[model samples]
Target chain A: TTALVCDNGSGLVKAGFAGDDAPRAVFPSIVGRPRHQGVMVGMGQKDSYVGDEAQSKRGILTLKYPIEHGIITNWDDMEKIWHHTFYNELRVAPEEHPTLLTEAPLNPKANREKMTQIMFETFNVPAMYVAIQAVLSLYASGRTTGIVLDSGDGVTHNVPIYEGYALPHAIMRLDLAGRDLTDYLMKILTERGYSFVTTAEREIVRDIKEKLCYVALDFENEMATAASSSSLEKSYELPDGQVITIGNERFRCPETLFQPSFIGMESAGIHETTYNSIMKCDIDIRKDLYANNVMSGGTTMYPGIADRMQKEITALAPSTMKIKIIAPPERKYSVWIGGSILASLSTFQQMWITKQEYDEAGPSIVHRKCF
Target chain B: TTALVCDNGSGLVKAGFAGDDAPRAVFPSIVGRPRHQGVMVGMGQKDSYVGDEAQSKRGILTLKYPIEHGIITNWDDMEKIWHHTFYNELRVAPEEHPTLLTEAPLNPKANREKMTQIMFETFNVPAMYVAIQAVLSLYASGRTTGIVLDSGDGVTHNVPIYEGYALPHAIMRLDLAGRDLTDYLMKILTERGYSFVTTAEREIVRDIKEKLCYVALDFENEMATAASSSSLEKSYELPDGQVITIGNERFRCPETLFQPSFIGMESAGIHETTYNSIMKCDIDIRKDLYANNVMSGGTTMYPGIADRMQKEITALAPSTMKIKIIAPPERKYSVWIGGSILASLSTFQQMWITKQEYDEAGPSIVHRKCF
Candidate 1:
């Protein structure tokens, strides 16, 4: 049976069929109504747009994100995002194919029940299995047991995936993530007498961060080198044709993820938290977890992050254990890839929470089968 | 080898020899100096006491706790506490016995190194092995894998143990704990026109909490029943013999552990955190974790806590999985008991960080072997 898979990330939605290695369609997780829109003839509502179209019309559209912190909180907008994914992106009928959805770790029971209800009653999904993002990230890396570090737009989580389960309690969360880094870059530029008073200016800062920022193997030495010379500096011209030169700020902004408290937030660094996550498991499995350390999400795309993480973790870890940080070529779509893998498996057919079961037992049935 | 085990908890210190099911000495984790004491000869210091002696001289003694939030922050007081445990209570020479100490999960590397230095240089310990308290608690329960809930004096931690290691990152902590319960009780009484003007009077409130407070299996139902009648009410005579009747307050105080938000705390409740911890692990091991749920420490002694936890967790957890809350009779000394078990094992001999290792590699060796 062909299955539809959707990875509902905090920043974007990636949707595709089970056999695909990558998502067929990817877009921002937002729904919008244009400023010039009027009530439609049959729908009796303002003209609406979802995903890329909605995000592109930012200036002219009133936009709303369906999910917050990787959770589907706004049901109305969530339904819209899912409907758009099925019909506009995949070009498939939602009721014909089983769908595998991903959720953040330690999701509220109420939220899960509500989503399950919405899928069966509202969207008429044939079958569903809500997989946690941590587990999916691990599965995508081809490991059933290891530590999964997903540093996305909203939050970064250091989760231990033992066998195929995502252990929620032991998961460590940090508020410093992709958006925080972008904001940090914007702040640094602002401090240097550069203005970022508008959304358009902020996008320029984000582009600078993605293109220029990288995790320093030795932050102090890198900072010293960058400060002493302009060799490592790069110039970027903005939409207004103003050129900006960036050097140490590139490393300094992303450095907050490793040393958050340096700016007054008392959260542990990603590497420290990763070591901490491994330390929570049995001594025998810790080395295995370290060896299979899988990194995913957008924030981790910064060059040299894996090497820097390896160095920091090795310094803190016991000399007997190996420290390896694995960031796949398609790390951004690891969760989607994992869902594809799980859905493609023959064993997964029995695992799906069927519509008949939902009709009899209600939405709570998702808890028993999906988890 | 006869190994000495010390579980330096926030409220009390439990110490004894390896193989002992129960600690030989249990005392308040406080160090005190008499108000009138002068500098003593030879020692060149004022007279001081530890444990019961220090607590008994409440009014006259200026008391200090060596450990705070399960960490040894004050080395001077810590040295005294350890010295007192080795000499006064155990009546053994520290230099002759191998030591097995229990520490809170994810203890700082710096703190562990400092402890190692103190043990080798000051106490002249022959050998030592520092074990995480959560793992030790699981070991005390005779289990190799489980979810260990340690609700102690200073803080409440939801830790997941696989095989024998405590997964550090997956561990969840809350500032609310045994001391919080006492403070809450005091606040409730204060609101009702009762006064606790001194430290001695505050101790009375603590005793009342211990004797009267219990977890409500169904908080709302219990609150309704309590409000409707005085059946659940009890009278507590203060230090000054003033009688105070406690009705719903008994359940209300302990209820804070389940619903911390009622008191304006942002942290999740005990059962919710427990489920979260288990959720961080692999899906295949979740059922095993649920079946092997273990509860230990001083604060968990509040009557019906385990039952209440089981009820709440069961409601939230998948229906197919069973919820088991294990509370041993000697849970207060579970950490020490686990240390005893580990220390007594012939296999554990090679696991100790020997004096030679410390001499050759320095204090940092503790991070290599202990964890």
Candidate 2:
């Protein structure tokens, strides 16, 4: 019995069959509705477009992200996107397999109820289990206990888990993450007399970010070195026949995670928040939290991030505490990978709440069973 | 002939009859739908709740923000909220009054088209105007040529206008604003052994912010004084019988606008962005932009914001140039106020896009007429 695993994030959606090495369907978590229906509606047309199809129709179709901050806010559009994912992307029947969905830390239990109702009544899934992303990421890294710092395109979370159970009280969150870095890159690029400001142009800026950006281990030293040294200077050409230089901004864009004040937001840095999260846990668990820190998520895929994070976390910890940080190469899909791994196991087969259970007990069964 | 004006912001909606001194209906821009239907459905319950009413139903009903970053994202919920505004709040017929709505800078022209279509086709409004928030803010401050820095709950914008026309290229945006400050306050309070992490408890932190947070004219100087003098110490009681102290955080929270790096983000500070916005304009308009900077929005309601902004802009400007920033006492409703003023005028009557015009020319007419 294969479980259908889906990590539905605010920025991107990852979905596939359980036991797969990676998600088969990866796309921007946006739903696009046709701006006008004069001629398009006259002919055969789908109600809404999803994923890459939605991104392609951006300017022509008013795009709406159904998910915000990793929670499903627009259920109408979400149903459309989820429908497309099943019919077009995965080409599967919802009732054929048990489903596994991902949720962010501190998600409203009310939302979980709604999600459960939607899946059981409308989509008619055989069974479903809503898993927290933090726990999944930790499991993906082959651990049941550790500190997991997961940063995606929309936001960042520093979650501490013990034996597969997340410490909800100790979890920390940040509004800044991968998208902020892309926007910062655009800001600096604009400051240097280049323009990449349109919604579609954002993809161009994002590409430049992935290719040129880096996390500097030491910001001040890097600033002085990048300012004087030609080693940091690189250039890329745009599709429209324009060239933009990559200078101090390469390292500076990712620097915001280390010192968010760089973007005018008021919060503790990622490293500080990770340290603070650990400190919030029980005193006895401090040693376990300190010795093993799992860096999981798309943002953590940046080169040298683990080392820089480890260095900063060590400096913040007690003198005698042993601290370490690990970044899996597949950090970008850690949650999805973990979901696949867990749902594939025979031991976890009966863990999901069935449609019969949902009909009998209703939506509250999601909270009672899943968590 | 009284027009209905609504500045439906992401955080709050300000709505009332044109020419009123204040918005008659002011509420958090949230929508709520009942989680379960048992006896409620049998008794013929309403489909949804909006604004203050929506907030009251939180936890019991699933809450959603129909608007995000000043754009209507969840059309179904937004339609519900909009319907509630006219039917419940104002007790006015949809076709009885001309409507005026607000849009953020750099909003997709496609979204404007959709708003126009929805207003005319669905609500059957006689006439409407999709007004830019920046232009309205400047108008509310009694100026046609100035720099408008409007910071609301979710985001901030620095826009320059010349003789009532907004300069699209000169606009600057920041993802940080009033809500960021509130979150920062919550963070500091949490760090001090108090927790306000729940969605409902966010209102508590927001209240504390409005009561205690202030922009420091000189953050460095204020930091030292706040550190030693006890001049900045303040405290507020939470509903649960706990008192949270406001120390340096009161000044530090708002300080993120001046020095965003404090939040670990990578971007130019607010003052610098405002100056850069002015400099982006044609050289001939710099003098006009420099002399009449208008501070308008909820975040700018902070004491000393104008003075601190003026000081910073002055330092960044050419030595010979003169810079000024004006903060209206009613800056919180600047956009709604300006919308009311414009819609109330006989001179602006011809400026509206009529239902007939929309029917004949279609949605594209919005871009041609409104802009």
Candidate 3:
């Protein structure tokens, strides 16, 4: 039996035939239309879109991840795009192969069931098993016990992996993630005196953030710089001949993740949320989770993330225990690596529920992966 | 005897020495930058900024808005920009002439006082009067017992001008104004999946909205069309070399003024809020307001706005009342034009508090304009 696996990161998408010659493609999960005609699908980054043709073409079609809270919200547009994507990736007809898909942990149960039905009915896949890639990555890393953070575009989910599975009691989620960061950037700009005529170009704003923006580990100092009179000296260009200047005022960009109120959001910080996710486990398991502290996701790519997370988590842990930060090379691919690793291990194959079992179990199929 | 006047419309700013031959300059009030920068400034139709070149040259300057909710929030930024603007317009010291500044009706007393103090201390102006521009425009239009609709970039304020004075008793304000519309447009794009990357470049979205977006006569029908697969294909754009088609998506776009639920806000929509504002007034007064319903300001430029507004407002009113939809030729510039006409007239100037009274009354000068 062959299994096709696909993972949607907050920042990118990774997909391939499971148990094959590794994964095939990883691209930002966004689809964009180039400014020029016939350039309908391209990568979203400046190098791909902005550097060359985008400099001249004006009207571009850009699509970002439509999933909110790690589940599909705009089903109509999302499903259409997803189908086109799957067709592009799978190459073979869906009837030709079984597939395994990854979604956020403790997914919106109703949406999950709907997606399952769609795969079975619409695509006519031979079989499907749903798994949380973050947990699988932990398993791939051979960590018997640890925490896995899935910070995707819409929101972030934190789960503790034990043995080879996620501990439900230790899972945590928050609204702050890539989307929130973009919003914060927008709010800061408006407060500074920039006038955006329409709301549609926030995508461009995100592009600006990607190119000219960087996360500051020391948010206070960064904000101080942005807020000073000198900020006006900074200028950047747009897809058109238009240019904008950065003002003297700077904001502690990363501090907003820890303190959403910096953008007027009333939410808990990443630090407290991470620590709190661990505290829910039993004493022994908490220590196990702490010692094996593992981070994976697009958001972890920010500067000072690993070190800062370690320092913050260390303070949050019971002082008696040792806490460490392990940075995965190609952190973006950690979960993908986990999927491939799981497929490689023969024992991991047993973890897969056969089509017969899935049909018989019905909703119980979820527990098959969980248990 | 000379007075300087400035009318900051939602789309344009008309500033001049009030007693001069005519207004010095009139330009759309938006500034643009591209997505390469880390800000969301108002660019032109393609997400570039519009308006003054000098201000545009300062595009690299971190932009800030002192004016919000029809008043200045960031006094420091407002002061600097106003100073730059003053030099651009007057080309002389402020103390050399008296100034008459137009403000929103029932402008916050605190903001009025602060602005007055700022002008007196900063420019050492000998005399100045802060009067409601909408009222003066109404007075200059030579219309009495009718509604004065002053729609601008920030919000729509309806003041009842009766027998030469605004009936504060009949003032109507809606949070859903020109700026709110731009915000809604931005919010829709951001949430759907694009980041508005540049501060100035995002203005293109606003320009599109101003130039192309229309208020559907029936929201449900328009929404259906905009959200339809065919309609979305026609409406939305992607950059060059990108091939991702997004369609049939429900943007919280119309809902910003109507629903605002996307942002988790439950405020009354422009329609309902306008109804409420009208209903709060005396019945006879309400009839007069509706009879001479004049839709002006940046929001009036919304596509299909007149038809939709006429339909909606007419439905909301009693059977006896007939709704009139008037879209002045320069709907967007009505406020500024009206202000210009008022400043140009000596008879209309009677409605204005003289420079001497402004000096003695200070911000208390609004008393004369209000009565």
lDDT, each prediction: 0.79, 0.82, 0.60
After superposing candidate 2 on the true structure, give the runs of residues whose Cα lies further than 4 Å from its correct spot. A33-40, A44-47, A57-62, A369-371, B1-371
Q: On TM-score, who's better, 2 or 3?
A: 3
Query: Candidate 1: which stretches are off by over 4 Å?
Result: A1-371, B34-47, B163-169, B369-371
Best by DockQ: 3
Best by TM-score: 1
Q: Tell me the tens digit of each residue's lDDT in model 3 across B250-367.
A: 2334435555444433345565655676775655577777777666556666656667667778888888888876666555555555555556666654655444666775665655
Model 1, range B176-279, lDDT digits (tens) per residue?
78877777778887867877655555666778888898888898988888757666988888656789988878988899898875565555788999999888
Which should have the higher TM-score, number 1 or number 3? 1
Can you write out model 3's per-residue Cα lDDT over A1-371, one digit (the tens) per residue?
56667675545567777775456766545434432243333573442331123323324443435566677775654555456547665465776766667777766787667677667667777777677766776765667677877665666777877775557876787767777777566645654445332223566666666555545555556556654456425677866668876542223445567776664455677777778888887776777777777777666666677777777777777788888866676766777777766666666666554556657767556555443
Candidate 3 lDDT at A343 equals 61
Model 3 Cα shift for residue B301 (angstroms): 12
In model 3, how well does chain A match by TM-score? 0.80
Give model 2's TM-score for chain A to 2 decimal places: 0.92
State every prediction's TM-score relative to the real structure.
Answer: 0.58, 0.53, 0.55
Model 3 DockQ vs. reference: 0.05
lDDT of 2 by residue, B40-101 (tens): 55667775777787676665566677876556778888787788888888788989988998
lDDT of 1 by residue, A21-45 (tens): 9899898877876544344657565
**What TM-score does chain B alone reach in each candidate, compared with the true chain B?**
0.92, 0.92, 0.78
Per-model root-mean-square deviation over C-alphas = 15.4, 25.9, 15.7
